[PDB]
Design a protein around this ligand. Structure first.
Ligand SMILES: Nc1nc2c(ncn2[C@@H]2O[C@H](COP(=O)(O)CP(=O)(O)OP(=O)(O)O)[C@@H](O)[C@H]2O)c(=O)[nH]1
Ligand SMILES: [Mg+2]
Ligand SMILES: [Mg+2]
Ligand SMILES: [Zn+2]
Lengths: 244, 1121, 49, 97, 97, 146
DNA sequence: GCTGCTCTTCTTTGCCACGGCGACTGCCG
RNA sequence: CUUCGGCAGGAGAGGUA
DNA sequence: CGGCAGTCGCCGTCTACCTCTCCAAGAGCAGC
C-alpha cells in the first residue's frame, strides 16, 4: 500500500511532496541558522551569483551523508559541497536532477528509486525491464528559439525530427534551432502520440478528437493497437515481413 | 428448556443466563404495528410512560390538514383512517399472481367560512399492502423483504480540522435539517466567522445577528469575551438591520428585484416558516440536548428558533477559545466537545414503517397541489369533497415504492437461516445514504460503539464489505430510531437483577463490567479489581466500588448466524466470517439429521424462522396423516393443520413438512408438531456427520480438494430435490388468435405420444432436452406456424404439476391473453465431482475424487472412513476449531464414563453433573464463549467406552492406526480420526458447464450474445490481447478477433470450409469499425479511408453471390424436419 | 496506531470477548484492500502498457 | 479420433502476465469438470475451491502451429521476469521429498 | 475490399456541402412507426424512400416482389428495390431554419 | 496559446466556418433500433427522441417565421432550438440534462464513444468469440505436463 | 355525448468522494 | 430445383473466484 | 498598469462469471 503511491509518483514524474534541495554549485556552505528556516546560501568557489535556499521548515532533518573527509557526519556551517547533493533529507526532484547533473544521472536516480520499493518487499525484477520505461519517458526536447524551423517556441517535439530539421535548415541556411532535454510522465507522453486512434482509445476521447479534427491529422496505421482495431496482423512476432 | 417438547441436549456452560432471547422478528412487525395503529401497539405503548399515542398515518394526516387557499374562505381536513378486510388469502395471492392488500378509507370535511355549510363523507384511497405473519410482503405473487436503513441523524455537528501551513486549528458547525437548506458557520485563517448560507458566499456572522435584531449594544455586551467576536464586529462594515438584510438579499440571488417585502419574506420563509424547513422530532430532540435549550417541555413545533442560532455561534466561539464548559442563559451545564459522525449515538435506523410513511407523505404532498388548484376552477355550492381529491398520485407512489426499489428486495429462500438473516439486516445504502465508490474507509470499519448493537463479524466480502451488517441478538430499537442493548445493574458491589436498556450516549458515561466476573453466589464480586469498559473504548482495571452496570451474558455481541459456530474463540476473524456467510448457502437435504456437537441456538432459530408447524392450543391429537393433522382442544373445538408437500422455493429448492407426532400424543401450546426443510425434531440441521481422516492421500486432495467415499452415493446421504417452472401464453395476433392443440403441422407421431387431449404433457412423464411441453401454433403471414414450449438445453426431469388459467373460465388474466400454462419439472441430484462442500469453520473445497469403499483407509475393525482432508491447509489459516470439534465429536459418538471410584479427578471439578456419564450417539452443546476447555477435552478423550468388542480404537491423543486399502500394509504412524459436520453448498457443477460453437448474434454489432441462458460466447478482453501480443502469436489473434466474432462474410465461409474439408480462407473486415465510422460521421466529423495515392475507398459492401449451397442454419437457430 | 493493551492468549487457549472484539479491526483492513486498492494497481498497469 | 492431437487454449482471470494462457492436448474424461495438472497451478494462480476456467479452440493451420510451438505448457517453465522456475514441486511434494 | 490495401485514416471538419453529399433525403416529420400496421411512416425517421426497403426486393406498395425487378424505382412509392441490409449504411439530414 | 489555434487553421486548407452548422446528419435506422416489450409497448431508444425534439422545434420555428411573428417570439424559438441541438450532441454539458421516464438522463451521441462502457473500450479492444466454453476445474495427478 | 386514439413533457420543491491540473477572474497594490 | 413464412434493448438488487 | 492567489470545473478511479424483477400517464380529440 505505502509502496505503490511512491512508484506512481516516480513514474508520473510529479514534484515530490517532501521535497529536498539539491546543491547547484560547489564551494563553502553557509548555514545562516534561523528558526523555521535553516537557510543555506553557498557562495561559489571561483565566483558567481548565489542560490537562496530558504523556506525549509523544521519538519525534516539533514543529510547524514559521508562528510567530505571520508568519515560521515551531518551538515552545519563550513562545509564543502559538490554538484549534486541532497542538502536536506527526503525525496529529491527528478526535474532538478535532469537540469543540473544530466540524463545519465536522472536515469540512475529513477532506476534506483523504483528498484528500492519493489526490492524492500522481496520482489526481484531484472533492471532491463525498467530501462525500457525510463527510455520511453525522456525522448523529447523543448524549443527556445525557432527562426527558420517553424517550431512553436516552448513546444515539445521528438529528438529525431529535431535533428532532421536542424540539419535541413543548417544546409542552404544559417539558423540552427536550439533545444533542451525534457522529462515526461507516462500519461502525458501516451497522449502525445502521432496516431489519433490510439490516443482516442486511451483516454479523453472528446478532447483528442476535437484537436485532431481542428488540426486535420492523418493516421499511418503502423502500431499494435491500430492493427488490432482495423483487423490486420500486428507488426510483431510472426507477422513481420521477414517471417511472413 | 422453556420449550414444551425440546430434545435433551446437555450443555458445557458454566454461567447462568438472567435474560431470555427476545422475539427475533419483532424489529419487522413492531414498526408495521406502529404504522397501522393496531390495538397491540396501543397496549404496548400504554404499558410504558407515553404522553399520547399517535400512530403512523394519522400523524401524516394531521401534518397535512388543513388545506386552505390564497383567499382563506374554504378548507379541507382529514381524520380517522380505517382498514377493511383482506381481499384474498396469502395462498391464493401467491397462486394467482396478485398483491396481498386491504382497502383504506378516510373521512374528509369541507369548510365554507362564508356561509357555514358542512360537507363530510368517507373517501377511498387505494389498496394498501399488508404484512403477513412472517414479516414479508407479497407483491405480484413474489415474496419481498423491506430492509432497514442506517442514516445520519439531523442536528448540529461541531468538527475540527488541521492545516497544511500555519497549523492553526480551524473549527466549524453544520445545522443539518431533515427537509431544508444547510447553514455553515466556521472560523478561518484570520479571525473571520463566516456563514456559507445555502452552500454559497462567505459573509460575516455579525451581519446575521444584526439583521435578525440584535442591536450593537447587546451584541457587543454578550458576544464580547473573545477577541474573535470583537474583531469580527469591528471590521463588520454593516450598520442597520436594513442595510444588513438588503446585503444578504442581494447576495443570495444576483440581479433581482430588491423589494424589502420579498426580502423579509425570504428570510422568514428560509429557516423560520413551517413548510420549507422541517427539523423533525428526532432532530429537534437532538438539538435541544446538545446546546442545553428548553428541556423536558413537549417537542411541539419544528422550526429553528433564533435563540439556538445565537447559541450555535456562542458554542463555536467557546470551543475555539478552549473553554470546555459553558451554559447559555436558561439551561443546564453542557460539555463543550466535538462530534463523531460515525458514533451510534448519531446514526439512527429507518425501519420499514418510516420507509413507507415517507412515500405516503410524498404522495399526499403531490395530491395537495391538485386539491389546492381545484378550488380556483370549480364553483361554490357545487364543490364536494369527492370532487377535489385525486387518489392517483398516492397509489402510483405506493406501487413505485413496493416494486422497482432499492430497499424492497427479492427474498432469500435457500433455507430457513438465509430467510431469517435477510431480515434483521441493516443497510447503509439507498435513497439518502452512501454510495459504493463515494464511501471511503472510515464508514466500513468497526467502531467501539458497535458492542451489543451490530455484529462485527457477519458482513459481505465483495465491494459491499462494511456497508451491510446484522442486528445483534439482544438489541432493540428506540421509538426515535436508536439501537438499545440490555445491561444488568450492580449497586453497592452487589449485582441486582433489574435490567436497564441503554443507548450509546448513555452507555459512554458509566463503567460497564464483564459477564465473566467472579460472583460469590450472593452478588458480591470475589476479586476487588474488575475489568470494565470506559468512555473512549479503553479497557482498564478499577476497584469494585464505582462499577454500576454488568453485561447480561457473553454472546451478547454476536448475531444469530455467528452464534451457531462451536469453538468460535479458537478461529480467526476471516475464517469465522466466511463460515457464518457460508452457512446460508446450504441446500435442504432429503434426511437432515441433527449435529452431534452444536451450540444452544439451533432450537430457537427454527421456531422463530417460521418453517415448522407449532401448536397454538393444548389438546389431544385425534388423527394423523401425511397431509394434515387434527388436534382436539380441551373445550371440544377442533383445529386441523395442512402441510406443504414438494413446494418450490424462490431459489429452486424443495420445501417439505412432515408430521412428528403420533395418534394419541398430548401436545401443549408451543410444541413443534411438524418438521420443515432443514429441521430435525424442531432443531436446525443443515448437514451430516461424517467420519474424517486428516492426512495427505496420493495428491487427490491437493490444494483444498476433497476425497469422498462411494457409500455416500449408494445410500443417498447427500441428495437434494430441485424443481423448475416453465410458462407459456396464448396472445392475440393481428392475423388471428393462437390456440393450444396437438395439431402441429406435418410432424411425426412418435414425438406426440405423451401429450393428452388438450395438448399438454401428462403427469409422471420423463422429459429430455428438446421435447414438447405445450403445443402452440400462430397464424403466419389455415395460416398455421409452430411455436411450442420445448425443454431448454441441458435440463431433464419428471413433470410433477400443471396449472391452467383460461379467460372464458372467469379468470383475471392480463390484456390480450387467452390462456396461461405452467409446468413443473423435478429432479433428484446426487453428489458428484465438482460439487462444493463446506464446514462451519471456514473450510471449503471441491470434490476431487469419489473412491470405492474397498480402497479407502479403514480402522482395525474394518470401518472405512468417509472423507479425507489435507493437513497442509490447517495451520496457516488459523482455524483450529475444526480439530477440537473432531475430537469432541468422536467423544460424543462413542460415549464415555469418567471413573470416579475415589473422589473426582481434578480436571472434572468444574464439570456439571449428568456430564460424567454418556451413552453412544449423544448430543452435547458448547455455547459460543463459555464451553469446553481444552483440559476437559483432554480428560474426556482418555475415558471412552469400547466398541462391540473390548477394543479402544482411538488412544488418548485422538489418533488411530489405519490400514491401506490398495496395498494392505498398515500406515507407519497414527492418524487423527473423528466425526465432523459437513454441509452441501448451492454451487453445483451441473449448473456451471457451458459450451458453444455457433449461435445467436446481436443486432447493432454482429458479435455473439452474452450469457448462458442464451448460447453466448466468452469475452476475450484487453488483458488476453496483451498476453497474446507478448507471446508473439499474430495469426491466432487475427483469427480470434475477426473470423470468430465480426467478419459476417467469413463466418459462413469458414463453416463450409471446415465441413467440406478444405483450407480456411482469409479474413476480411469487421463490423464494429464500420459502426464506429458511421457514428463519427454522425458527429459532424469527416473521416475517410485513403489509399496509396489518395482516392478514398468507398467501404461499401460488395455484390456477392451469397447463395446458400448447404442449407443448414450455421447456428443462429436449430433444425426441424 | 498500536493499542497499548496486548492480547496475552493464543488461539489454542482461546481469546476472551474483549480480546476478540479488539482483534476484528485488522481483518477488515485486509479484506477491504483486495476489493478497493486493486484499482490503483490495474490503472498503473494499463498506463504502463 | 477427431480430437486427437488438436490443441486447446486454457485461460483463467485475471490474466496478469503472459503465462495466464497455455495450450494443452485434450483427453476425454467422465464428468463435467476440467482436470488440471498440479504443476501448472503456480502460473495460473489456481486453487481447487470453486475456480473456473475458459476453453478456446484454434481452427486454422497457423493458429494450430502457434499453439503447439509457441504456447505449449511444456515449453514455458521459467518466469519471463527473473528466470526463476515456475513448474516446480511445492506444498505436498516438498514435504515428501 | 482487402484490408491490406488501407494506407491512411484522415479526420477533419465537415461542412454543409459534405453533409448534404452523404445524405439520401431530408426528414421533416417527427413520426417513426405506425402502431397499427407496424410499418414506417412517410418522410419520418424510419422512412423507406430515403433509408431503404424493409424487406428484400420489396416495395412500399406491393407492385415489385421478385428479384429480377431489382434496381428500378417504383412509380408510386418511390422506394428502391434492393437488399434490406442497405438500411445500416444510408444517412439522412435535417435542414435547420 | 492563441497561435496554437490560429496557425492550425492557417496552415491547412480548412476554413473556420465549420463550427457554425446549417444541416444535421441522421444516423442509419439500423443503428438505433426499437425493441418490443412483451408484445406490447415499446421500450424507447434514447437517440430517437432527441431527433424528435429537434424536428419539432425546427418546424415550429419555420412556421412562426413563415407567418411573420414579432422578433421576441422567434428569438425565444431560436434559443430553444439551439439548446435542443446542443442536448442532442452532448447532453449535460451546459445546464440540466434532458430527462426521460423515471428521472433518468438520456444518452447522447457523444456518450457512445467515451468511458469504460463506450465503443472504443468495449467493442473494439475486446469481443465475444465462438468455439468457447467454461466449467469448474479439479486436480488430476495422472496427466503429463502437456 | 360514447370510449379508442393520439400527442406531449418548466415554480416550487428537490438538491447532496477525492486528488491533480489548468484557466480565469475579480482584486489589491 | 422447395413457394411464402418464422428473433435478441436499458435500470436496479444479490452472489462466486 | 501589473502581478496574483484563490477557486472552480473537468479528468480518472482492476478482470471474468451467475441468479432475480421491472420499464408514462393524463388529457384532449375524434367519427359516429
Ligand atoms: N482482480 C480480482 N481478483 C480477485 C478478487 N477477489 C478474489 N480474487 C482472486 O482470488 C484469489 C484469492 O486467493 P487466496 O486469497 O487464497 C491467495 P493464497 O492462496 O496464496 O493464500 P491462502 O488462502 O493462505 O492459501 C485472488 O488472488 C484473485 O486471483 C477481486 O476482487 N479482484
Ligand atoms: Mg490458494
Ligand atoms: Mg480459490
Ligand atoms: Zn411502390
Amino acid at each position: 500500500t505505502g509502496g505503490l503511491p511512491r512508484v506512481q509518483e516516480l513514474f508520473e514524474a510529479r514534484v515530490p511532496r517532501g521535497k529536498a534541495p539539491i546543491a547547484d554549485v560547489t564551494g563553502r556552505v553557509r548555514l545562516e541558522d534561523g528558526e523555521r528556516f535553516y537557510k543555506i546560501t553557498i557562495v561559489p568557489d571561483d565566483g558567481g551569483e548565489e542560490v537562496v535556499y530558504d523556506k525549509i521548515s523544521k519538519r525534516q532533518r539533514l543529510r547524514v551523508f559521508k562528510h567530505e573527509d571520508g568519515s560521515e557526519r551531518v551538515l552545519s556551517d563550513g562545509d564543502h559541497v559538490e554538484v549534486g547533493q541532497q542538502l536536506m533529507e527526503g525525496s529529491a526532484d527528478p526535474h532538478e536532477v535532469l537540469r543540473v547533473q544530466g540524463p545519465r544521472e536522472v536515469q540512475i536516480h529513477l532506476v534506483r528509486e523504483v528498484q528500492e520499493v519493489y526490492r524492500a518487499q522481496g520482489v526481484s525484477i531484472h533492471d532491463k525491464h525498467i530501462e525500457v520505461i525510463v527510455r520511453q519517458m525522456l525522448r523529447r526536447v523543448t524549443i527556445i528559439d525557432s527562426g527558420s524551423t517553424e517550431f512553436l517556441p516552448g513546444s515539445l517535439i521528438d529528438r529525431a525530427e529535431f535533428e532532421a530539421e536542424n540539419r535541413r535548415v543548417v544546409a542552404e541556411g544559417g539558423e540552427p534551432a536550439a533545444g533542451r532535454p525534457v522529462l515526461m510522465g507516462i500519461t502525458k507522453a501516451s497522449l502525445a502520440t502521432d496516431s489519433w486512434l490510439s490516443a482516442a482509445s486511451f483516454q479523453e476521447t472528446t478532447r483528442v478528437l476535437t484537436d485532431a479534427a481542428i488540426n486535420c491529422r492523418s493516421d499511418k496505421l503502423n502500431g499494435l493497437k491500430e492493427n488490432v482495431i482495423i483487423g490486420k496482423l500486428i507488426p510483431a512476432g510472426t507477422g513481420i515481413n521477414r517471417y511472413r | 428448556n422453556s420449550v414444551p417438547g425440546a430434545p435433551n441436549r446437555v450443555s458445557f456452560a458454566k454461567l447462568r443466563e438472567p435474560l431470555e432471547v427476545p422475539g427475533l422478528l419483532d424489529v419487522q412487525t413492531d414498526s408495521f404495528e406502529w404504522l397501522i395503529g393496531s390495538p397491540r401497539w396501543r397496549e404496548s405503548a400504554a404499558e410504558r410512560g407515553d404522553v399520547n399515542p399517535v400512530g403512523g398515518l394519522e400523524e401524516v394526516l394531521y401534518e397535512l390538514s388543513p388545506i386552505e387557499d390564497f383567499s382563506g374562505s374554504m378548507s379541507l381536513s382529514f381524520s380517522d383512517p380505517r382498514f377493511d378486510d383482506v381481499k384474498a388469502p396469502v395462498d391464493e395471492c401467491k397462486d394467482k399472481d396478485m398483491t396481498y392488500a386491504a382497502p383504506l378509507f378516510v373521512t374528509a370535511e369541507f369548510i365554507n367560512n362564508n356561509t357555514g355549510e358542512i360537507k363530510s363523507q368517507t373517501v377511498f384511497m387505494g389498496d394498501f399492502p399488508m404484512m403477513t405473519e412472517k414479516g414479508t410482503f407479497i407483491i405480484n405473487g413474489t415474496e419481498r423483504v423491506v430492509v432497514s436503513q442506517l442514516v445520519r441523524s439531523p442536528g448540529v455537528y461541531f468538527d475540527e480540522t488541521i492545516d497544511k501551513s500555519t497549523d492553526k486549528t480551524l473549527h466549524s458547525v453544520k445545522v443539518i435539517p431533515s427537509r431544508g437548506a444547510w447553514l455553515e458557520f466556521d472560523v478561518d485563517k484570520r479571525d473571520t466567522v463566516g456563514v456559507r448560507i445555502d452552500r454559497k458566499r462567505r459573509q460575516p456572522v455579525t451581519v446575521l445577528l444584526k439583521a435578525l435584531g440584535w442591536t450593537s449594544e447587546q451584541i457587543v455586551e454578550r458576544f464580547g469575551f473573545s477577541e474573535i467576536m470583537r474583531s469580527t464586529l469591528e471590521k463588520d462594515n454593516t450598520v442597520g438591520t436594513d442595510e444588513a438584510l438588503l446585503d444578504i438579499y442581494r447576495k443570495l440571488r444576483p440581479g433581482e428585484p430588491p423589494t424589502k417585502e420579498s426580502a423579509q419574506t425570504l428570510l422568514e420563509n428560509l429557516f423560520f416558516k413551517e413548510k420549507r424547513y422541517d427539523l423533525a422530532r428526532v432532530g429537534r430532540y437532538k438539538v435541544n440536548k446538545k446546546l442545553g435549550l428548553h428541556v423536558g417541555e413537549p417537542i411541539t413545533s419544528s422550526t429553528l428558533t433564533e435563540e439556538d442560532v445565537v447559541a450555535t455561534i456562542e458554542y463555536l466561539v467557546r470551543l475555539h477559545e478552549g473553554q470546555t464548559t459553558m451554559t447559555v442563559p436558561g439551561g443546564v451545564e453542557v460539555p463543550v466537545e466535538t462530534d463523531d459522525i460515525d458514533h451510534f449515538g448519531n446514526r439512527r435506523l429507518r425501519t420499514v414503517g418510516e420507509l413507507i410513511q415517507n412515500q405516503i407523505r410524498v404522495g399526499m404532498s403531490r395530491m395537495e397541489r391538485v386539491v389546492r388548484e381545484r378550488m380556483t376552477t370549480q364553483d361554490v355550492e357545487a364543490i364536494t369533497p369527492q370532487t377535489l381529491i385525486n387518489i392517483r398520485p398516492v397509489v402510483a407512489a405506493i406501487k413505485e415504492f413496493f416494486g422497482t426499489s432499492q430497499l424492497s428486495q427479492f427474498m432469500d429462500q435457500n433455507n430457513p437461516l438465509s430467510g431469517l438473516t435477510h431480515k434483521r439486516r441493516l443497510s447503509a445504502l439507498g435513497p439518502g445514504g452512501l454510495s459504493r465508490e463515494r464511501a471511503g474507509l472510515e464508514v466500513r470499519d468497526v467502531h467501539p460503539s458497535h458492542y451489543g448493537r451490530m455484529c462485527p463479524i457477519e458482513t459481505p466480502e465483495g465491494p459491499n464489505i462494511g456497508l451491510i451488517g446484522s442486528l445483534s441478538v439482544y438489541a432493540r430499537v428506540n421509538p426515535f430510531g436508536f439501537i438499545e442493548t440490555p445491561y444488568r445493574k450492580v449497586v453497592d458491589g452487589v449485582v441486582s437483577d433489574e435490567i436497564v436498556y441503554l443507548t450509546a450516549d448513555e452507555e459512554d458515561r458509566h463503567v460497564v463490567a464483564q459477564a465473566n466476573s467472579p460472583i460469590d453466589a450472593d452478588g458480591r464480586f470475589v476479586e476487588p479489581r474488575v475489568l470494565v469498559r470506559r468512555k473512549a473504548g479503553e479497557v482498564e482495571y478499577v476497584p469494585s466500588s464505582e462499577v454500576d452496570y454488568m453485561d447480561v451474558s457473553p454472546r451478547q455481541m454476536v448475531s444469530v448466524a455467528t452464534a451457531m459456530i462451536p469453538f468460535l474463540e479458537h478461529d480467526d476473524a476471516n475464517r469465522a466470517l466466511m463460515g457464518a456467510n457460508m452457512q446460508r448457502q446450504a441446500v435442504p437435504l432429503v434426511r437432515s439429521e441433527a449435529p452431534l456437537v452444536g451450540t444452544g441456538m439451533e432450537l430457537r432459530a427454527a421456531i422463530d424462522a417460521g418453517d415448522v408447524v407449532v401448536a397454538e392450543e393444548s389438546g389431544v391429537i385425534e388423527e394423523v396423516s401425511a397431509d394434515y393433522i387434527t388436534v382436539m382442544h380441551d373445550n371440544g373445538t377442533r383445529r386441523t393443520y395442512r402441510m406443504r408437500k414438494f413446494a418450490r422455493s424462490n431459489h429452486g429448492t424443495c420445501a417439505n413438512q412432515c408430521p412428528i407426532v403420533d395418534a394419541g400424543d398430548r401436545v401443549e401450546a408451543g410444541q413443534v408438531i411438524a418438521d420443515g426443510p432443514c429441521t430435525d425434531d424442531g432443531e436446525m440441521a443443515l448437514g451430516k456427520n461424517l467420519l474424517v481422516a486428516i492426512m495427505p492421500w496420493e495428491g487427490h486432495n491437493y490444494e483444498d480438494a476433497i476425497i469422498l467415499s462411494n457409500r455416500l452415493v449408494e445410500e443417498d446421504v447427500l441428495t437434494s430435490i430441485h424443481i423448475e417452472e416453465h410458462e407459456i401464453d396464448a396472445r392475440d395476433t393481428k392475423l388471428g388468435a393462437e390456440e393450444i392443440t396437438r395439431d402441429i403441422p406435418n410432424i411425426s407421431d412418435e414425438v406426440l405420444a405423451d401429450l393428452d387431449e388438450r395438448g399438454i404433457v401428462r403427469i409422471g412423464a420423463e422429459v429430455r432436452d428438446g421435447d414438447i411441453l405445450v403445443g402452440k401454433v400462430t397464424p403466419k403471414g389455415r395460416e398455421v406456424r409452430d411455436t411450442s414450449l420445448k425443454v431448454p438445453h441441458g435440463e431433464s426431469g419428471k413433470v410433477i404439476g400443471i396449472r391452467v388459467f383460461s379467460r372464458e373460465d372467469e379468470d383475471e388474466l392480463p390484456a390480450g391473453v387467452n390462456e396461461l400454462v405452467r409446468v413443473y419439472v423435478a429432479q433428484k441430484r446426487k453428489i458428484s465431482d465438482g460439487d462444493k462442500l463446506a464446514g462451519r469453520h471456514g473450510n471449503k473445497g471441491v470434490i476431487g475424487k469419489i473412491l470405492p469403499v474397498e480402497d479407502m483407509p479403514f480402522l482395525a475393525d474394518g470401518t472405512p472412513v468417509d472423507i479425507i482432508l489435507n493437513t497442509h491447509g490447517v495451520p496457516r489459516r488459523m482455524n483450529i476449531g475444526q480439530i477440537l470439534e473432531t475430537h469432541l465429536g468422536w467423544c460424543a459418538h462413542s460415549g464415555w464414563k469418567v471413573d470416579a471410584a475415589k473422589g473426582v479427578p481434578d480436571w472434572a471439578a468444574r464439570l456439571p453433573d449428568e456430564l460424567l456419564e454418556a451413552q453412544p450417539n449423544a448430543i452435547v452443546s458448547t455455547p459460543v464463549f463459555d464451553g469446553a476447555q481444552e483440559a476437559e477435552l483432554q480428560g474426556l478423550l482418555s475415558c471412552t467406552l469400547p466398541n462391540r468388542d473390548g477394543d479402544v480404537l482411538v488412544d488418548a491423543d485422538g489418533k488411530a492406526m489405519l490400514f491401506d486399502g490398495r496395498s494392505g500394509e498398515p500406515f507407519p504412524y497414527p492418524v487423527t480420526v473423528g466425526y465432523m459436520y459437513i454441509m452441501k453448498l448451492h454451487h453445483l457443477v451441473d449448473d456451471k458447464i457451458h459450451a458453444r460453437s455457433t449461435g445467436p448474434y446481436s443486432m447493432i454489432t454482429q458479435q455473439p450474445l452474452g450469457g448462458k441462458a442464451q448460447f453466448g460466447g466468452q469475452r476475450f478482453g484487453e488483458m488476453e490481447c496483451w498476453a497474446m501480443q507478448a507471446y508473439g502469436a499474430a495469426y491466432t489473434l487475427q483469427e480470434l478477433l475477426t473470423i470468430k466474432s465480426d467478419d459476417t462474410v467469413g463466418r459462413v465461409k469458414v463453416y463450409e470450409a471446415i465441413v467440406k474439408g478444405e483450407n480456411i480462407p482469409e479474413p476480411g473486415i469487421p463490423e464494429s469499425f464500420k459502426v464506429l465510422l458511421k457514428e463519427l460521421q454522425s458527429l459532424c466529423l469527416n473521416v475517410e479511408v485513403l489509399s496509396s495515392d489518395g482516392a478514398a475507398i468507398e467501404l461499401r459492401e460488395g455484390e456477392d453471390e451469397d447463395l446458400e449451397r448447404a442449407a443448414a442454419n450455421l447456428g443462429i437457430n436449430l433444425s426441424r424436419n | 496506531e498500536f493499542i497499548p493493551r496486548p492480547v496475552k492468549s493464543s488461539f489454542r487457549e482461546g481469546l476472551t470477548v474483549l480480546e476478540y472484539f479488539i482483534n476484528t479491526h485488522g481483518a477488515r483492513k485486509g479484506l477491504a484492500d483486495t476489493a478497493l486498492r486493486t484499482a490503483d494497481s490495474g490503472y498503473l498497469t494499463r498506463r504502463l502498457v | 479420433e477427431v480430437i486427437a492431437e488438436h490443441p486447446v487454449l486454457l485461460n483463467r482471470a485475471p490474466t496478469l502476465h503472459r503465462l495466464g494462457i497455455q495450450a494443452f492436448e485434450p483427453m476425454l474424461v467422465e464428468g463435467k469438470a476440467i482436470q488440471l495438472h498440479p504443476l501448472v497451478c503456480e502460473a495460473f494462480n489456481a486453487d481447487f475451491d470453486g475456480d473456473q476456467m475458459a476453453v478456446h479452440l484454434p481452427l486454422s493451420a497457423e493458429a494450430q502451429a502457434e499453439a503447439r510451438i509457441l504456447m505449449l505448457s511444456s515449453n514455458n517453465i521459467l518466469s519471463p521476469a527473473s528466470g526463476r522456475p515456475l513448474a516446480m514441486p511445492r506444498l505436498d511434494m516438498v514435504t515428501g521429498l | 475490399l482487402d484490408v491490406n490495401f488501407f494506407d491512411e485514416l484522415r479526420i477533419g471538419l465537415a461542412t454543409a456541402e459534405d453533409i448534404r453529399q452523404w445524405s439520401y433525403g431530408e426528414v421533416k416529420k417527427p413520426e417513426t412507426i405506425n402502431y397499427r400496421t407496424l410499418k414506417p411512416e412517410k418522410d419520418g425517421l424510419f422512412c423507406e424512400k430515403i433509408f431503404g426497403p424493409t424487406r428484400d426486393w420489396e416495395c412500399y406498395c406491393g407492385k415489385y416482389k421478385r428479384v429480377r425487378f431489382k434496381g428500378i424505382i417504383c412509380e408510386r412509392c418511390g422506394v428502391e428495390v434492393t437488399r434490406a441490409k442497405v438500411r445500416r449504411e444510408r444517412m439522412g439530414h435535417i435542414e435547420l431554419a | 496559446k492563441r497561435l496554437k489555434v490560429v496557425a492550425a487553421f492557417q496552415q491547412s486548407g480548412n476554413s473556420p466556418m465549420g463550427m457554425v452548422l446549417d444541416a444535421v446528419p441522421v444516423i442509419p435506422p439500423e443503428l438505433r433500433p426499437m425493441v418490443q416489450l412483451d408484445g406490447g409497448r415499446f421500450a424507447t431508444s434514447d437517440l430517437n427522441d432527441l431527433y424528435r425534439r429537434v424536428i419539432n422545434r425546427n418546424n415550429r420555428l419555420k412556421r412562426l417565421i413563415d407567418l411573420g411573428a414579432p422578433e421576441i417570439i422567434v428569438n425565444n424559438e431560436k434559443r430553444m432550438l439551439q439548446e435542443s441541438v446542443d442536448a442532442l450532441f452532448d447532453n449535460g454539458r451546459r445546464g440540466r440534462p434532458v430527462t426521460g421516464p423515471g428521472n433518468r438522463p438520456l444518452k447522447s451521441l457523444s456518450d457512445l464513444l467515451k468511458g469504460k462502457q463506450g465503443r472504443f473500450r468495449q467493442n473494439l479492444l475486446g469481443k465475444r468469440v465462438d468455439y468457447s466454453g467454461r466449467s469448474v476445474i479439479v486436480v488430476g495427478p495422472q496427466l503429463k505436463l502437456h
